[PDB]
Structures are given as structure tokens and as C-alpha cells.
């Protein structure tokens, strides 16, 4: 896989821009979505937790979102 | 940083899966407002929901926060599992619960 680097750069962004607590919170939501939660659900949760200052997080997450859900995630941008 | 590394590891394994008293103290998190409420055993799930509605004045979802053990608490079973996890942990002193609105 050629996108192993693209994961590390995203991990790097999280490690470097998010507070420790915002990471645990995000990890938790991300685990729900991984484990069968809708995309609409996930996005609603993100929007309540991450305002303007955290766009990079949402953006950097886009390519990790599967195509069918990706359609809804992109419009979810402001 | 212990909690931080454990989160970042969780996030990594999740993304890499893109496609292949003895009272229970619950720490509630809602828009940066921490609120600790104790519940006596046996803790009832509907009573916890009841408490959230009263304290915070609106229907809120309970997001159990524990990296790869995190879950949307939907039933007595989910809660008992969280409670068990906390019972057997050497570090955790409270159940952490992020409150979000369903809409």
C-alpha cells in the first residue's frame, strides 16, 4: 500500500495540533464510526465538537472515508 | 501522555481499517462543562438518562469514552460493560461520558 505515508502524515497532524483530551474524544467518536455508525451521525457529532479552528482534522480525514460515505462527508464541509 | 498514546494508537487502528462507597462516579462532558455525578449500585441505565435530561435540560447521547472500548451507550448491557471496565482498571477513577445532541 502506497498510502501508509498518508496515514502517518495524518497521525502527525493529530499529534501536533490537537490537545490530549481532544484526541481521546476524537478517538472515541472515530471508534463508533468504525464500528458501524452512520456517516450522518458521525458528522453531526463532529460538528458539535469541532468548530472552525479544527477544519484540518475534518479535511485530513476525507480520504480515509469510503466512497459511498465520502459523498455525504464532502458536502458536510462548510 | 499515557491516555494520549493509547488514543493515537486507537485512531491508527481504526483508520488502518479504512477498508481492510462503591458508587459509580460518572464524569459528564458537555461543551467543556465537566460534571461529576455519583450513582449507587445497582446503576440503572434509564435512571442515568433521566439524570442527564434533568441536569442538562435536553436529551443528550451518552458517548462512553475509552479509545477502542468506546461506545454509544444504548442499554443496561453497554453500561454494565463500561462499569466493569472501570472496576478492573488500576488507573480510572470515573466513567467518562461525552454528551452530544442527536440532532
Residue numbers in the entry:
A (entry chain A): 293 to 370
B (entry chain B): 0 to 19, 42 to 124
Study authors write:
MEKK3 (MAP3K3) is a highly conserved protein kinase essential for embryonic angiogenesis in mice. MEKK3 interacts physically with CCM2 but how this interaction is mediated, and its relevance to cerebral vasculature, are not known. MEKK3 contains only two defined domains: an N-terminal Phox/Bem1p (PB1) domain and a C-terminal catalytic domain. We find a direct interaction between the harmonin homology domain (HHD) of CCM2 and the N-terminal region of MEKK3 encompassing both an N-terminal helix and the Phox/Bem1p (PB1) domain, and determine a 2.35-Å cocrystal structure of the complex.
